Design a protein around this ligand. Structure first.
Ligand SMILES: *[C@@H]1O[C@H](CO)[C@@H](O[C@@H]2O[C@H](CO)[C@@H](O[C@@H]3O[C@H](CO)[C@@H](O)[C@H](O)[C@@H]3O)[C@H](O)[C@H]2NC(C)=O)[C@H](O)[C@H]1NC(C)=O
Ligand SMILES: *[C@@H]1O[C@H](CO)[C@@H](O[C@@H]2O[C@H](CO)[C@@H](O)[C@H](O)[C@H]2NC(C)=O)[C@H](O)[C@H]1NC(C)=O
Ligand SMILES: *[C@@H]1O[C@H](CO)[C@@H](O)[C@H](O)[C@H]1NC(C)=O
Ligand SMILES: *[C@@H]1O[C@H](CO)[C@@H](O)[C@H](O)[C@H]1NC(C)=O
Ligand SMILES: OC[C@H]1O[C@@H](O)[C@H](O)[C@@H](O)[C@H]1O
Ligand SMILES: [Ca+2]
Length: 641
């Protein structure tokens, strides 16, 4: 009915920021090859202050060469004795974010690790000092090569922690003069981390934040007892339609209200991965067409604004926050300098369903809300007003100032369903705008890449999304016909997070493609036992990469060939002998039209009119039989969608 907002009785918990994740996995893959100015606009919509999402926090995967949801991300140590601080795009992303917001808070977390850390096991805790050394090299590198200070380091995404590891990781950070860097654990459930902290003072000393995943707005008693900052360190993961923006809006408030969480971080920052990959379009905005420049500033960018443009890490929540009588919720915060921000949400059950968890139905309906400013707040007479309505929508529209000059220090609102209001003393608010970008367009139906780039800006060719193994630009001075190629660089299975395939593979193009011709030069580096393939109609990737079907055309250095229906090689379409050895350049062609396929070795037919499942559709792809060195060159694809 009436709700009091006051601070004379003290303050709530310190606010830590709203953020998002790049990674887990390859979520930003297709953002790096956006033409300008679009790439830069997209970044502005995410990171520029007083503009778009205006994020406070950027969390990135520390790549371990394993598949980690929508692809793999390259590690800084592929092998023992390898150190390279320039692979992939997270370094870049971090720099672009610091460019726009110098005060952005940066976080790193591993999902997978290179297999060599396991010392013969797929386990990152066999040698604690080795795994810590690995993780600490990354933090050092960020600083030494990119001038990036990493503020928070995690443990092992949604996997078990080892308390001795966390202790070692702290000792190791300190030893390298990284006392400044804080530790967040365990990026999984509230337990066993929370009880672990109450039972072990030494573990308690070295963990600074409890970050939990998909908590459904709630915490647990042990976490409250710990006195640690509590964060939803990964949340959201829902299609950025109105439903998703509704989900985001509700949990932004109710994570603090119900769960005492002082930060929430969305997976993922931006949908820059093929939509047909797992959890497609579940970023705060969409940017999945570098070939066209098309991007969508989706509802969740403006939901974010309603909190980020009007708060900063270091502000405090008030004690007075809660639910509304008739549905929805409200939080309020101050900076302790006379500024006050009020964020109100009325998301209806039906337009705010998150993927994890699903909420039993709850009611929201029209209501009036009366707010009264007691304590050091009574002295406020003017408040700027921002308003969003989800579902025909209006986004982040500024409304006329509200005045409380009567001396009541009180006002009232006509709240309805699926609305958000931000009431703030701050006047910096802005609904940033660039002109609309180009219209969406399918992936090009003729496409070529000869990999001829001597100093590439990124470590991998555009549009190729690795789903097992890691493919890289490769310069080979000692050959002149193939001096610039794409090379698969893993020589052993990673300490996996997902169920990586047994074969490496990178997918590309348009998932709708159904008739297509794929050509590529391939070179097998391993004698006797090596193998490579090219494919089309590849229908699954990411988390599901093991399930992928399609038409796979393999050659091996034992003088043989197989055509399979599946990446796992279980199902045979044709197989035979071929004049193929290791360490020789061969040109593969694969043609698939309706019910039939054919392969050519070096322009000459190897197999014709082999029957294949149809209809079927999916990407094109290149890859290798195991985790083995191989090269590709002069890639082309001609497709019909
Ligand atoms: C990919 O290739 C398949 C196979 O070529 C395409 O399906 C085929 O579509 C054609 C024409 O669109 C069908 O042609 C036939 O033409 C005669 C004469 O006018 C007509 O009387 C028949 O009823 C039929 O329309 C053909 O039957 C059909 N083949 C199969 C196996 O379904 C497909 O359109 C191609 N996909 C894309 C989008 O490029
Ligand atoms: C409200 O917010 C601002 C920013 O936090 C407070 O600080 C001043 O704000 C102006 C405008 O941004 C700056 O140009 C000054 O340099 C800031 N002064 C200081 C000492 O930081 C401001 O004091 C707060 N008070 C209100 C309600 O306006
Ligand atoms: C957390 O929130 C509850 C209500 O949701 C509140 O009563 C309690 O004081 C808070 N716990 C803290 C800040 O430790
Ligand atoms: C929700 O509550 C309102 C107000 O009490 C009521 O009019 C409406 O019938 C309720 N809807 C459901 C499905 O419970
Ligand atoms: O909902 C999808 C997300 O789920 C999390 O468990 C994971 O950390 C993310 O990488 C992503 O897969
Ligand atoms: Ca070349």
């Amino acid at each position: 009915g009436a709700y009091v907002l006051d601070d004379s009785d003290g303050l709530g918990r310190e606010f830590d920021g709203i953020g998002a994740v790049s990674g887990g996995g390859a979520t930003s893959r297709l953002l790096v090859n956006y033409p300008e100015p679009y790439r830069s606009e997209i970044l502005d919509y995410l990171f520029k202050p007083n503009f778009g999402a205006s994020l406070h926090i950027l969390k990135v995967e520390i790549g371990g060469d394993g598949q980690t949801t929508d692809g793999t991300e390259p590690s800084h140590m592929h092998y023992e004795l390898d150190e390279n601080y320039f692979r992939g795009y997270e370094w870049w992303l971090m720099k672009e974010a610091k460019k726009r917001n110098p005060d952005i808070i940066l976080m790193g977390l591993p999902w997978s690790f290179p297999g060599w850390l396991g010392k013969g096991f797929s386990w990152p805790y066999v040698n604690l000092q080795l795994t810590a050394y690995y993780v600490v090299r990354w933090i050092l590198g960020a600083k030494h090569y990119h001038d990036l200070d990493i503020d928070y380091i995690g443990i092992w995404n949604e996997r078990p922690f080892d308390a001795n590891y966390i202790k070692e990781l702290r000792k190791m950070l300190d030893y390298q003069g990284l006392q400044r860097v804080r530790i967040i654990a365990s990026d999984n459930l509230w337990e066993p981390i929370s009880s672990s902290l109450l039972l072990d003072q030494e573990l308690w000393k070295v963990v600074d934040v409890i970050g939990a995943h998909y908590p459904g707005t709630y915490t647990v008693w042990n976490a409250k007892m710990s006195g640690k900052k509590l964060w939803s360190s990964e949340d959201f993961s829902t299609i950025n339609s109105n439903v998703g923006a509704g989900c985001w809006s509700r949990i932004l408030n109710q994570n603090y209200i119900n769960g005492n969480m002082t930060s929430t971080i969305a997976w993922n920052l931006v949908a820059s991965y093929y939509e047909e990959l797992p959890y497609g379009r579940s970023g705060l905005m969409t940017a999945q067409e570098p070939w066209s420049g098309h991007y969508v500033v989706a509802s969740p960018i403006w939901v974010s604004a309603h909190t980020t443009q009007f708060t900063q890490p270091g502000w405090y929540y008030l004690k007075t926050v809660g639910h509304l009588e008739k549905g929805g919720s409200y939080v309020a915060l101050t900076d302790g300098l006379g500024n006050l921000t009020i964020i109100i949400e009325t998301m209806s059950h039906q337009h705010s369903m998150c993927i994890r968890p699903y909420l039993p139905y709850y009611n929201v309906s029209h209501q009036l809300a009366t707010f009264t400013l007691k304590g050091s707040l009574r002295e406020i007479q003017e408040l700027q007003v921002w308003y969003t309505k989800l579902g025909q929508r209006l986004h982040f529209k500024q409304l006329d100032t509200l005045w409380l000059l009567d001396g009541s220090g009180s006002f009232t609102l006509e709240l309805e369903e699926d609305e958000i209001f931000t009431l703030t003393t701050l006047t910096t608010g802005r609904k940033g705008s660039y002109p609309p970008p180009p219209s969406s367009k399918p992936f090009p139906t003729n496409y070529k890449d000869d990999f001829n780039v001597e100093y590439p800006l990124f470590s991998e060719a555009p549009n190729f999304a690795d789903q097992t193994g890691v493919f890289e630009y490769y310069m080979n001075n000692e050959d002149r016909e193939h001096r610039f190629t794409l090379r698969q660089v893993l020589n052993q299975r990673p300490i996996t997070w997902a169920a990586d395939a047994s074969s490496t593979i990178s997918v590309i193009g348009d998932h709708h493609w159904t008739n297509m011709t794929v050509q590529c030069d391939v070179y097998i580096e391993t004698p006797r036992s090596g193998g490579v393939f090219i494919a089309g109609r590849v229908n699954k990737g990411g988390i599901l990469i093991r399930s992928a079907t399609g038409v796979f055309f393999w050659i091996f250095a034992n003088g043989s060939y197989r055509v399979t229906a599946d990446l796992g090689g279980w199902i045979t379409y044709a197989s035979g002998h071929a004049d193929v050895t290791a360490k020789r350049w061969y040109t593969l062609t694969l043609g698939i039209k309706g019910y039939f396929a054919f392969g050519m070795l070096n322009g000459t037919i190897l197999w014709k009119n082999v029957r294949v499942k149809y209809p079927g559709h999916g990407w094109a792809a290149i890859g290798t039989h195991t985790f083995e060195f191989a090269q590709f060159d002069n890639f082309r694809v001609e497709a019909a969608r």
